[PDB]
């Protein structure tokens, strides 16, 4: 028994006519995906299908495989090709055949690190190939066999043998097939082509080896219940009885998140929207705590021209809780906006404002010229120029050593006023009050779904209830400390929790040489809710599909439960279910004056078997 990537039994494989001659010609070979490997089949009796291409971009920005065959050698290369739009192999006679087979496949091959030359692969001889690519290893399997069908796949059994295990290290997403037509836009000809394509899926198979070295039979353990029984018994034959095979579950159909109302909004609109702003040498540092910060408003607005955010990602900030948040405010020129960074130097960087190399904050900033400037300029923004020493980060003093800024409302960008807001987050030994918002959902009901009630996670079905909570309790618990009921944070109503269905599956079958029919029992499940076809009959042990409720009673043959038995009967043949009987009535003729005495006798011999001992073993 082995689990691998196999092609499922009894499926549809696609049949491509690469070239069709109706009158005229029709050339079309597409580019197909490469999911988990491919099964490729051909039966054409000529040298037309002559290799393959594998790759992702199929351009010169990445590497690509190339497998070519010319009836004398097989050449495998891994290079950085730039393939044509319609790649094909052109043989041109100088002569009829055996000439310089040109390469119209590509036009460039640079910087490439593989080569493999060997004996031909493709040596009416139906040919089958299987391709795989796992852990930087390209594996090929092949097999040839002669057939006589007109147009179909034979009904037999053959096993493919390994060919090559090349150690390439590239990524593969798409693949394409090569054809070498002829030479004789319309200056080339060809006869015909057709091939079968199929895809592999992860399955589990049961294979049989004979006394010699070959594989003879296989069983797929997903086709029907009988195959599942054969695979779970590790045998190709099954005796009469009832066997347990697998479990039955119900899957969630949606997701639910419920949280209390969004209040106590944190005043982020005071440091951004404000008629007055501070200067470079005198900040407006503000502390923020015990509030709910709406970060998504800031980075979803089409009015900020600088949002480079170091330390943390701008999107995960909604799932982090801090203790304190500090906000600054500068009004500087447009040229030094780049100087506010963990690493930078200059006038403003070293004299007015400096930042450490572990900032874990960011520098949201924008432009404003129609409001912060007037007709006369109003040079009311000052800054320092000379200092006795470099100023360390997170330190500034209040105090002609100061000069004003022009900000003339005609100059180009690079000198116009720009407003900068700088935020920092801190986590000290404290309950970390500051947290981000939490969104909710529409509270669907009556389906087995997943719920997140204010911190309670789980799966199940919700419904109304009659319980009454004291007006401070949130949820309830059972005897075994399992959650039973909850309360909606927004509507303050009580809801119950019930697990969605689950059970086991049993298969009822007669002996294997008799018939191939089965019946299926789903245990303890009311099957008005079963996802799933024959007669349906409900018992006290679950419900049964595939049997008819016969009308009489006999002795028990295959026990099921609660006094119900099943058997293979003849009246056409079928499987019937009934209630077992105990015996035949034997009412005795009792009076107060009659006796019965036997007159003649028999001698009887019976047998009894008893085990006495077992085997003596020892382990070191």
């Amino acid at each position: 028994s082995t689990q691998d990537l196999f092609l499922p039994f009894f499926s549809n494989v696609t049949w491509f006519h690469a070239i069709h001659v109706s009158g005229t010609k029709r050339f079309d070979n597409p580019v197909l995906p490469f999911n988990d490997g491919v099964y490729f089949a051909s039966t054409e009796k000529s040298n037309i299908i002559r290799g393959w291409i594998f790759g992702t971009t199929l351009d010169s920005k990445t590497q690509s495989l190339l497998i070519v065959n010319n009836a004398t050698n097989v050449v495998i290369k891994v290079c950085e090709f730039q393939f044509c739009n319609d790649p094909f192999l052109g043989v041109y006679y100088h002569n009829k055949s055996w000439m310089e087979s040109e390469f119209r496949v590509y036009s460039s091959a640079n910087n490439c690190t593989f080569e493999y030359v060997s004996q031909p692969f493709l040596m009416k001889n139906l040919r089958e190939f299987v391709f795989k690519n796992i852990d930087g290893y390209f594996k090929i399997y092949s097999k040839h066999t002669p057939i006589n069908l007109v147009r179909d796949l034979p009904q037999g059994f053959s096993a493919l043998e390994p060919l090559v295990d090349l150690p390439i290290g590239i990524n593969i997403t798409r693949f394409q097939t090569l054809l070498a037509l002829h030479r004789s836009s319309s200056g080339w000809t060809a006869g015909a082509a057709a091939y079968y394509v199929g895809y592999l899926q992860p399955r589990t198979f049961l294979l049989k080896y004979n006394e010699n070295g070959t594989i003879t039979d296989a069983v797929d353990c997903a086709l029907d219940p009988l195959s599942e029984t054969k695979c779970t018994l590790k045998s190709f034959t099954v005796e009469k009885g009832i066997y347990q095979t697998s479990n039955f579950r119900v899957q969630p159909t949606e997701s639910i998140v419920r949280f209390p109302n969004i209040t106590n909004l944190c005043p982020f609109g005071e440091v951004f929207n404000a008629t007055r702003f501070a200067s470079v040498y005198a900040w407006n540092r503000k502390r923020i705590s015990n509030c709910v910060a709406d970060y998504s408003v800031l980075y979803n607005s089409a009015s900020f021209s600088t949002f480079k955010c170091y330390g943390v990602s701008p999107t995960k900030l909604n799932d982090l809780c801090f203790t304190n948040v500090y906000a600054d405010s500068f009004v500087i020129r447009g040229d030094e906006v780049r100087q506010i960074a963990p690493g930078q130097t200059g006038k403003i960087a070293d004299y007015n404002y400096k930042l450490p190399d572990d900032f874990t904050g960011c520098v949201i900033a924008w432009n404003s010229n129609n409001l912060d400037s007037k007709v006369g300029g109003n040079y009311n923004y000052l800054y320092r120029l000379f200092r006795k020493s470099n100023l360390k980060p997170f330190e500034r003093d209040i105090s002609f050593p100061l000069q004003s800024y022009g900000f003339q409302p005609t100059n180009g960008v690079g000198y116009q006023p720009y407003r900068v807001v700088v935020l920092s987050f801190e986590l000290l030994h404290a309950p970390a009050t500051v947290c981000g918002p939490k969104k909710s959902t529409n509270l669907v009901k009556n389906k087995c779904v997943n719920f997140n009630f204010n911190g309670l996670t789980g799966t199940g079905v919700l419904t109304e209830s009659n319980k009454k909570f004291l007006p401070f309790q949130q949820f309830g618990r059972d005897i075994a400390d399992t959650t039973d009921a909850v309360r909606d944070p927004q509507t303050l109503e009580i809801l119950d929790i019930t697990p969605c269905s689950f059970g086991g599956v049993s298969v009822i079958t007669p002996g294997t040489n008799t018939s191939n029919q089965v019946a299926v029992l789903y245990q303890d499940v009311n099957c008005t809710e079963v996802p799933v076809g024959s007669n349906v009959f409900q018992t006290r042990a679950g419900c049964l599909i595939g049997a008819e409720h016969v009308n009489n009673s006999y002795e028990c043959d295959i026990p099921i439960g609660a006094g119900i038995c099943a058997s293979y009967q003849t009246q056409s043949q079928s499987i019937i279910a009934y209630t077992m009987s105990l015996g035949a009535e034997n009412s005795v003729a009792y009076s107060n004056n009659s006796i019965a005495i036997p007159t003649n006798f028999t001698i009887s011999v019976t047998t009894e078997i008893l085990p006495v001992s077992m085997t003596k073993t020892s382990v070191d």
Partner: antibody
Amino acid sequence: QVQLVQSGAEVKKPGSSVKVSCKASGGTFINYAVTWVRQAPGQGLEWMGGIIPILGIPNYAQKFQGRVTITADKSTSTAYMELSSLRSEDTAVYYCARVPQAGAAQGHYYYYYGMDVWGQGTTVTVSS
Amino acid sequence: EIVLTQSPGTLSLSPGERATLSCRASQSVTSSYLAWYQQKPGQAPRLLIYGASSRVTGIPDRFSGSGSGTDFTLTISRLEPEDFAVYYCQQYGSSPLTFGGGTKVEIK
């Protein structure tokens, strides 16, 4: 010459389900990637899902999980999308679109081109 | 989930001038995969530029695009009366595919 056509407008009540179809004519349709895009009135565009008919496994967005289902029929060459458990916010216009160059690699999808051919639009109004 | 933000909410211009539209991403787009769409009222969108540099055939030569990393830009050098519509930026280097927010360009 590849063109896609959709069905007509629909009006629904909350709690029901809707099914929209997309018929493409003039191409292979087998190795394409058929997507689905939703545009609300006076809003932007959103991504719902997509499918490659030859493979048979679709990809869904996280928001529309357990509520939408995308399938395809190769013989009639038609893609279906079904939306269940309707709310009052599921009133928008739906578009088919097509990505010409798509691959698979593992169970996920990989795109090497943008959508070039679009449908026409089907309005689904949900109210009572 | 990569989030794209279009910096100018609305642009008002005049015929014969040039425009400039930006599309900033929260992270770095993988392999610089970006596409630009132009939509008019009552009609489906239309693809103009893919790969942030390449241009689909049949699109006028006045449209161009550039950028990389987390900053991408689109330019129309010579505006025309038929160029006033909504514009969107989309990324397809990962999953799920995410669109922009739109940027109106009109004179009315």
